[PDB]
Amino acid sequence: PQLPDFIQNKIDHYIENYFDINKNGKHLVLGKQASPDDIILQSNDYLALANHPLIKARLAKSLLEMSASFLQNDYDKPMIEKRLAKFTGFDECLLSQSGWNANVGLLQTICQPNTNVYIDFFAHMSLWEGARYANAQAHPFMHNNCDHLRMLIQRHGPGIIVVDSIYSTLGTIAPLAELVNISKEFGCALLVDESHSLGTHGPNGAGLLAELGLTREVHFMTASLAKTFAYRAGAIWCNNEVNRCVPFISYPAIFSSTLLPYEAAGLETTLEIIESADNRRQHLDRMARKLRIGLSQLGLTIRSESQIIGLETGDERNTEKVRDYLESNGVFGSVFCRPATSKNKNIIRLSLNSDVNDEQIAKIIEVCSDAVNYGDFYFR
Amino acid sequence: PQLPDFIQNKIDHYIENYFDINKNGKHLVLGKQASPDDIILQSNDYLALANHPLIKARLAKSLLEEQQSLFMSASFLQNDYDKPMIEKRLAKFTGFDECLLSQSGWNANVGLLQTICQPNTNVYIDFFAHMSLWEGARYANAQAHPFMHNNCDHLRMLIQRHGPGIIVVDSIYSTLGTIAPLAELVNISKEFGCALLVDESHSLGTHGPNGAGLLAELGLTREVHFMTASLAKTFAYRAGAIWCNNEVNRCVPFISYPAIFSSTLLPYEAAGLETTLEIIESADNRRQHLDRMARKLRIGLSQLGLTIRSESQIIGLETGDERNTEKVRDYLESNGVFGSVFCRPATSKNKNIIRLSLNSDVNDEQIAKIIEVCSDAVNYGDFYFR
């Protein structure tokens, strides 16, 4: 059944302006195929746990042998939640199907149809849509800009301040200490997404709030477990009662099925293995810094302060050229383009993980050095 | 950390207006704990595949095989060598040109609506269609136009009045267990230049040739633009899929927010689904059984005078307001029958439902007990029905 025009028209225009314009007839995010020799910097599995023998074993053993609301009794709630909460220092933790759902769910629970939400420009898209589904009043503030933040709160009233601890496209770090002060001052709740800091930062990997000593000041913490925990799930920690209600309020929690008990048993192993990876955290940290210093001396804006490094490659055409160069030279990042970015501010993201060599770090810098000189594109 | 008042007070009111009011202090969906003797009817595992050894084997087997640290958006894995053979197998299984994998039924629906919709777009949706279809629409800012449950007349007038658009339905509705009038809707879709989208979550695998679904049973597959399913029912797995008889699946992976900004299924989950597909392809036995048992239950209850709108393995007990619903639940659980409470936001506060979901492991003896308990319930119990 051929499509009606109202759909077909849209689909053609999309196909035209998003696939056809690229030199390979594909979406900008899709490039070449990588070799076993090439350097891949795409995964969010920062501590390189995706193959971990123990973790796999725990899962197989547990799988050998509906909705989440009907499982909110004391006897129905998994040990993994008590361990994560303890781990993080927060009072309660609630499992979700994903980081995305965790954000969406928390926000729908705690928000009302005009609630002030003060969200960093670069906060994960799920926080945005979170506030949007709840029909909250979104108040964007310039990246990590507390002055802008103050203005807007002063202007619009108390509400919920929303940030990534470590930003997904840029590797920047939120001014958590100052944001904690700001929410105290203006009687606001603070929601922090530690997707990119949890496991990689803090004491035993417990995260940045843990590292900065700010856990006790923060109302809410969320995270995807599809980064360091290398698992398709989410979690919401509360220093309050909200978690008793989220399972009955959040749509994703109500009308969408939950993880099974073996999935939750697999996380417990991951947690242990994470707590002890002081080795991998330190090495990764070393590597990120090495890479960060090396790209900066080249002239590239490198805002990152973490294991996520953003090569700012301007507009789509330029971004394609940059990507092709990087890939032809054995370096594979991930293109971030609209709607994650704006059309004219794409990023090629380099995700570092604990498996990366000093040798591989020197190659990335080198390849970028030569890129800088080549002259087929520019960097911002 | 003292929550702001505009939060502390939302929670404090909810806790009381939803938890406190119930006899057990718990939410209305939470009854007592079930014993082994009790007849549990809450699962969506219609063919009883959850603890299947062959499925467990392949999941575990492929899980143990190797890492591919593919913790990233599914957008990044859309090259044809990157796309799982389960999609191609599912496509062929249902007869659609293209299948695409999603992290859940909910996402399948949201993602697809985001992709085909413009803010102006007309969306003719069944009053009782799954929430994920309403929210998808609402998220795309589309022009939603609800029509009365399974009413082709009401639907015609809407399209008549508002123009071409997307017709959205469940094949089998998840609360009432009713079956949409698919043949007619197809025709209406043609009689007005609309697109058809059917959510077969509750018919896929339980229905049609080899469980290929309801569209396939009726020979409609070629006439329909779109089908979606939760794979968390008969397929018993946390994932969803989108089927297109067109090129829309080329674009979903890049426009759907869920599909872009949330992590993809691991390749070992794909491998797992494959075994399940085979099992289901082969489960004619478990189907026929379920079908017959559902029919016994439906007749059994209808003869009791109860409204039994269902025509499937989902039976809707209509139990009115929350108080009265609370009494019906306790009574059904007091005897060994659970029992799946549907209430706001799923239903109107006044039209709550206690859903009985049958599966292939249910036996004649058990039905009778169910009928016996509701008969006594009608009847003897201090509460009403609709």
Measure the CA–CA gap between A148 and A166, rounded to whole angstroms: 19
Q: Give the phi and the psi of residue A309 in degrees, each rounded to 5.
A: -120, 125
Measure the CA–CA gap between A13 and A16, rounded to whole angstroms: 5
A5-15 vs B105-116: helix axis angle to the nearest 10? 90
Closest alpha carbon within chain A to B259: A100
Which tokens sit at A236?
Answer: 């919401």
The sign of the dihedral angle between the CA atoms of A190, A191, A195, A198 is: positive
> Min CA distance, B292 vs chain A (Å)?
24
What distances in angstroms separate CA A192 from CA A104, A131, A219, one per listed residue?
13, 14, 9
Give resolution in angstroms.
Answer: 2.5
- Experiment type: X-ray
Q: Give the phi and the psi of residue B316 in degrees, each rounded to 5.
A: -95, 110
Which tokens sit at A324?
Answer: 């092709």
Domains of chain B, with CATH numbers? 1-51+284-386 (3.90.1150.10), 52-283 (3.40.640.10)
Q: Supply the DSSP symbol for A260.
A: P
B127 touches chain A (CB under 8 A): no
Contact state of B79 with A189 under an 8 Å Cβ cutoff: no
Question: Which of B261, B340, B359 would best serve as a mutation to test chain A binding (most A beta carbons within 10 A)?
Answer: B261
Measure the CA–CA gap between A346 and B93, rounded to whole angstroms: 40
Contact state of B131 with A255 under an 8 Å Cβ cutoff: yes
* Per-residue burial over B51-61, b = 16 or more CB atoms within 10 Å of its CB, e = otherwise: ebeebbebbbe
CB neighbours of B129 closer than 8 A, spacing ≥ 6?
B168, B169, B170, B173, B199
Q: Are B62 and B271 in contact (CB under 8 A)?
A: yes
A54 touches chain B (CB under 8 A): no
Which tokens sit at B184?
Answer: 């007619």
B206 touches chain A (CB under 8 A): no
B340 touches chain A (CB under 8 A): yes
CB neighbours of B218 closer than 8 A, spacing ≥ 6?
B182, B183
Which tokens sit at B59?
Answer: 């999941």
Measure the CA–CA gap between A3 and A8, rounded to whole angstroms: 5
Q: Give the phi and the psi of residue B329 in degrees, each rounded to 5.
A: -60, -55
What distances in angstroms separate CA B307 from CA B92, B263, B301, B311, B318, one per listed residue?
39, 43, 8, 12, 7
CA A96 to centroid of chain Cα atoms: 15
Measure the CA–CA gap between B102 and A14, rounded to whole angstroms: 21
> Min CA distance, B18 vs chain A (Å)?
9
Query: Is beta strand B240-244 parallel, antiparallel or unpaired with respect to B226-230?
Result: antiparallel
3-state secondary structure of B121: coil
- Furthest-apart CA atoms within chain B: distance in Å: 63
Closest alpha carbon within chain A to B43: A66
- Terminal Cα distance for chain B, rounded: 47
Cβ-Cβ contacts under 8 Å, B64 against chain A? 56-57, 60
Query: The tokens 């954000």 sit on which residue?
Result: A103
Q: Give the phi and the psi of residue B170 in degrees, each rounded to 5.
A: -90, 140
Measure the CA–CA gap between B353 and B306, rounded to whole angstroms: 13
Strand order in the sheet with B98-102: B98-102, B240-244, B226-230, B195-199, B166-170, B122-126, B143-147
